[PDB]
């Protein structure tokens, strides 16, 4: 088993960035090697995308997965799952059905070596708050998650502010339970300051300052290094990356920053997202040192 022992923040890639290529021009192994060319070790997969015969992969596939991890020095970091209690049109899932689905994903994530889950829930309002029984769902799975060393993390992304209600609801739950196995994934879109002229921005959105992350860092277990535009000097031109990374270095962050690209041009003929990601990782390697 390859282990990556760098102290402080580490870089990686979320395979969602390859969403226009995966299954068409890139295989899973192509993505692993693409990360290897970058020297990136951390990976995020989507449970519903990257696991053959999901939800029930074979032993043979699981062993091929572990062989790939060792062959390309990939650390399974974050596992993306959905607790979709709205999967049926006619009714919501019961708390127990949702917990059963979540526990199965925790089991599979543990089997593939992941330690963080990026869990997405159905949202019920414009603040993107989760379903009302979410605490019950999470409390149903927390013992298993604690037993298997997995941390379940909803994702904070635009327009949700680091000082808004959503974040404080999660932090309050963590404080009230005392759990060490539920936390936060901060997507860097919450720091974006620059936008194109005439580009619509949600009036509810206000950029956070990098220091706004400092009081949340005890609960942040993984981050989406979202990025919009990489210049040919290998600088990111919309988010204060130097200051965000320096803030997290200086305040004890030990997790990963996983590149996430979501531009519509991923789906343009001739686009080469692997090159975009290489630009981003030139940036990340120079900011982190490795």
């Amino acid at each position: 088993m390859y282990r990556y022992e760098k102290k402080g923040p580490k870089r990686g890639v979320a395979l969602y960035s390859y969403s226009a290529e995966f299954g068409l021009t890139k295989t899973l192994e192509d993505c692993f090697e693409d990360l290897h060319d970058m020297g990136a070790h951390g990976i995020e997969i989507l449970a519903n995308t990257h696991i053959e015969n999901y939800p029930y992969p074979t032993d043979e596939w699981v062993e091929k997965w572990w062989r790939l991890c060792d062959k390309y020095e990939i650390v399974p970091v974050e596992y993306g799952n959905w607790i979709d209690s709205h999967v049926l049109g006619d009714r919501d899932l019961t708390t127990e059905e949702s917990v059963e689905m979540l526990k199965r994903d925790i089991r599979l994530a543990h089997r593939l070596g992941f330690t963080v889950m990026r869990t997405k829930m159905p949202v019920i309002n414009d603040l993107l708050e989760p379903v009302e029984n979410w605490k019950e769902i999470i409390k149903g799975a927390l013992p298993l998650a604690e037993e298997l060393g997995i941390k379940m993390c909803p994702e904070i992304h635009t327009p949700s502010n680091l000082k808004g209600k959503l974040v404080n609801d999660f932090v309050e739950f963590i404080k009230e339970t005392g759990t060490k196995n539920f936390g936060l994934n901060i997507d860097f879109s919450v720091f974006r300051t620059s936008f194109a002229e005439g580009e619509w921005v949600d009036p509810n959105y206000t950029p956070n300052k990098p220091e706004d992350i400092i009081p949340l860092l005890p609960y942040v277990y993984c981050c989406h290094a979202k990025f919009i535009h990489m210049s040919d000097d290998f600088k990111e031109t919309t988010i204060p990356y130097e200051e965000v990374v320096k803030t997290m270095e200086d305040n004890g962050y030990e997790g990963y920053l996983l590149s996430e690209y979501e531009g519509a041009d991923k789906y343009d003929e001739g686009y080469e997202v692997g090159q975009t990601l290489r630009k981003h990782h030139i940036l990340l390697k120079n900011l982190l040192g490795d």
Binding site: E33, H36, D37
Partner: peptide, 13 residues
């Protein structure tokens, strides 16, 4: 793989 002869995957020091 890719249509081009030189692949983008596997280029590294």
């Amino acid at each position: 793989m890719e249509k081009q002869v030189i692949q983008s995957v596997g280029f590294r020091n």
